[PDB]
Amino acid sequence: GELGLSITGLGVQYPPYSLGPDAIDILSKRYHPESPAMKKVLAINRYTGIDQRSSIGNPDHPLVNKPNPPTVKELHEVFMSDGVPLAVEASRKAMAEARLVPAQITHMVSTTCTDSANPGYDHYVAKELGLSDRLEKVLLHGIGCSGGLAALRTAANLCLGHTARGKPARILVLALEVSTTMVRSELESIDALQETRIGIALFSDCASAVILSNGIGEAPGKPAIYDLLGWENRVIPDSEHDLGFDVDPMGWKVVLSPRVPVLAKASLQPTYADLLSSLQDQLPSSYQKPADFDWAMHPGGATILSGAESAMGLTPEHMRASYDRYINHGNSSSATIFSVLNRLREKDMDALAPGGKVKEYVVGCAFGPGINVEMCMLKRRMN
Amino acid sequence: GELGLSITGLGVQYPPYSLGPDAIDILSKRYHPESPAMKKVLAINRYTGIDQRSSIGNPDHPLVNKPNPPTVKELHEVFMSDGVPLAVEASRKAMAEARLVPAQITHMVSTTCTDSANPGYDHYVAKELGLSDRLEKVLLHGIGCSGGLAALRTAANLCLGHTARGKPARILVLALEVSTTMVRSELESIDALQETRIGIALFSDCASAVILSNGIGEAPGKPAIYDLLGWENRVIPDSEHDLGFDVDPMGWKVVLSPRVPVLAKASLQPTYADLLSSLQDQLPSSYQKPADFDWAMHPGGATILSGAESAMGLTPEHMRASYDRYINHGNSSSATIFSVLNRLREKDMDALAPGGKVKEYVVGCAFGPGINVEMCMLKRRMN
């Protein structure tokens, strides 16, 4: 009946010398001769609908300007020196809005696809935040772009695990991604292979975090931003070779087929229907069809956004925070998700879907490698 | 009070060449001329007390006979090619014992430190097994050796999340590690850097699985192997640099300080006390002191087992299953533990710590990077 799940805090931290413009990889393309496959990447780059890409540094950064592309190990160092502190910060903010002190946190569910370490990057955030030594941690791998909502769903079950025993649960949900440092890697592949490869044109850096509470022993008033009502997750069969992030001495090589937008669009109607199938009577009749909702969509391609607005019959305004993030920060893989949710609850209320009706019910949506599809139903609290 | 969590199946799958003799890495010096630090590792190799060591190949395998060490990309290939069939077989055997049909598996939790992938390797495993499309997967990263027990603990929480919601839960808990393929990477470090580095003398290849059940939708007949009663987990402070696996162009580099065994030893007593105190009211008088239980220790180092014997006041036989796996297979990272538990309930129960006395209660225990400590309490259903 009542799950008692709520996001009680959200925080985002994009790196500062962000906004690597458009002249960006046009400029770093100074490590390769002119070639017609390269030219095409530069061309497509101009109509991704992205204006600025948030990044841990500028096209001048040392790591990006070695005679060679940085090795996977050189990536790990900058992931730590520049990536982690975004993660620490995003968490402080989230914990501040949730009015929680380090000691109250029970689990941590983190994700990333742009690092590999033992101990994982999560250990280090926890360390600096001073979380308990008795904390329960989960670092998700293998999922890339769908990572935010996966971590959220896993946080949910986990919270509920503690609800079973009667224990308060405050799960820090962490996403950190640093992809822009892999520009040189992607530039070599475009040069050597002569395939176009649109990966460099889309990905960016960010960290974001939410606190998920199971409501047991919650601070008086029990004040949350979103309640978490339900979630649906699924894997599209025989679609491994369409989308992926293969390990490499230079980090990870992007895999993307012509089929991805179609499979991504086609998934929405059945997945949506299953989200609502398991939620009837719980929501009012004014929230039945996709347009009755606000849509926290993970962007990661203009084509994916417009794909949705056609398939589900939405306006761009329904995904107003999705566009806002995409245009001004790029596709920050698993970390864009919460970055959208936090943005949605601000001043976006104006550019909003209909005449001017802010929707009480919000559907989170996302996909990534494997082609996993993730979707969740949220209830925004009207102040 | 009654968690109703139970291990209803188990399965282990070692590679074909498994038995890798001690001569292996000695003769694998068709690649380096003798050096001081190298002589010292080949010596330590013969002090580990490991008889045989499990490997997906023999010393002549093509991957480890190239002019250079294989790249991390090349490791992945053979991880897919030779590691996955192991995880599939392991999982198949666990489900068979559990008398479970693919469509019944509601969650999957997997671990590995010897691969990175998108989609991650647990996707290919689910496909091969014909698992559901609405399967919720967790691929754990960053935790090396304590992976087995961490995945158990995580599955435990997941099981209860479903319990809180009145749903059945049947979770495939899986550990796959292929470490012998990194022999050339480590061998090069030993030579190039002239430092000891013992990893190459310890690690091995294995896949192990377990089915954790939440009991809902199960008949009260419910035959099981172990009931899961409780769990403690902790991070030892300021010990990140003692255990680890660093990402490298040629895979992952071992970090293994001489401090490691010492810190392990010193965590045993306190963590056991925390475990027992949450469960003492639930246990009989005859299971109260470390020596009263059987001990599913994760080996990797003989010092851990000898350290545990005196730290807690045990005899080697108290952990007879640990020795059997260490001696005959080496240290298979996160895959060893479930193998220790599988072997434990066989006719290993004839080297019982005291007389004809198999113990009804077994404490599982495992150390890993970050210096993570995992301990759990099992109830062996005595037929």
Chain A residues whose CB is inside 8 A of the B247 CB are 72-73, 75-76, 115-117
Q: Could you tell me which residues come within 8 angstroms of residue A159 by beta carbon, excluding any fewer than 6 positions away?
A: A5, A107, A169, A171, A212, A213, A214, B161
Q: In 3-state terms, chain B is what percent helix, strand and coil (to 5)?
A: 40, 20, 35
Domain boundaries, chain A: 1-224, 225-383
B164 → chain A, closest CA residue: A164
SS3 B203: strand
SS3 B243: strand
Q: For B331, which DSSP code?
A: B
Chain B residues whose CB is inside 8 A of the A240 CB are 119, 123-124
Q: Which of B145, B159, B206, B365 is catalytic?
A: B145
User: Do residues B64 and B28 touch, judged by C-beta distance below 8 A?
Assistant: yes
Measured CA to CA, the distance from residue B218 to residue A188 in angstroms comes to 56
SS3 B272: helix
User: Do residues A160 and A5 touch, judged by C-beta distance below 8 A?
Assistant: yes
Closest CA to A317 of A349, A360, A285: A349
CB–CB contacts below 8 A, A to B: 183
Name beta bridge partners: B374: B233, B366
Token pair of A222 as six digits? 């029990």
CB contact under 8 A, B370 and A141: no
Q: Is A311 exposed, middle or buried (0-12, 13-18, 19+ CB in 10 A)?
A: middle
Backbone angles phi, psi at A365, to 5 degrees: -145, 145
Q: Which residue has the tokens 């309640």?
A: A227
**Pairing mode, strands A226-235 and A6-13:** antiparallel
Token pair of B341 as six digits? 């538990």
Handedness of CA A75, B367, B121, B327 (dihedral sign): positive
B76 → chain A, closest CA residue: A247
Considering only the beta carbons, identify the residue of B3, B249, B372 that sits closest to A249: B249
Measured CA to CA, the distance from residue B211 to residue B228 in angstroms comes to 12
Token pair of B195 as six digits? 């430092």
Token pair of B197 as six digits? 């580095």
Considering only the beta carbons, identify the residue of B115, B119, B372 that sits closest to A240: B119
Q: What are the Cα distances from residue B137, in Å, to A143, A297, B109, B131, B278? A: 10, 22, 6, 11, 30
Measured CA to CA, the distance from residue B138 to residue A225 in angstroms comes to 26
User: Do residues A305 and A299 touch, judged by C-beta distance below 8 A?
Assistant: yes
CA distance B279 to chain A (A): 14
SS (H, E, C) chain A: CCCCCEEEEEEEECCCCCCECCCHHHHHHHHCCCCHHHHHHHHHHHHCCCCCECCCCCCCCHHHCCCCCCCHHHHHHHHHHHHHHHHHHHHHHHHHHCCCCHHHCCEEEEECCCCCEECCHHHHHHHHHCCCCCCEEEEECCCHHHHHHHHHHHHHHHHHHHHHHCCCCEEEEEEEECCHHHHHHHHHHHHHHCCCCCHHHCECCEEEEEEEECCCCCCCCCCCCEEEEEEEEEECCCCCCCEEEEEECCEEEEEECCCHHHHHHHHHHHHHHHHHHCCCCCCCCCCCCHHHCEEEECCCCHHHHHHHHHHCCCCHHHHHHHHHHHHHHCECHHHHHHHHHHHHCCCCCCCCCCCCCCCCEEEEEEEEHHHEEEEEEEEECCC
Considering only the beta carbons, identify the residue of A73, A107, A126 that sits closest to B247: A73
Experimentally, how was this structure solved? X-ray
User: Do residues B315 and B353 touch, judged by C-beta distance below 8 A?
Assistant: yes
For helices B336-344 and B320-329, give the axis angle rounded to 10 degrees: 130
CATH superfamily of B1-224: Thiolase/Chalcone synthase (3.40.47.10)
Measured CA to CA, the distance from residue A323 to residue A316 in angstroms comes to 8
Residue B145 known to be catalytic: yes
Q: What are the Cα distances from residue B279, in Å, to A73, A229, B269, B308, B364? A: 44, 34, 16, 21, 14
CA distance A145 to chain B (A): 10
Cis peptide before A21 (omega within 30 of 0): no
CB contact under 8 A, B161 and A157: yes
CA distance B138 to chain A (A): 6
Q: Do domains B1-224 and B225-383 have the same CATH topology?
A: yes
Q: What is A225-383's CATH number?
A: 3.40.47.10
CA distance B285 to chain A (A): 25
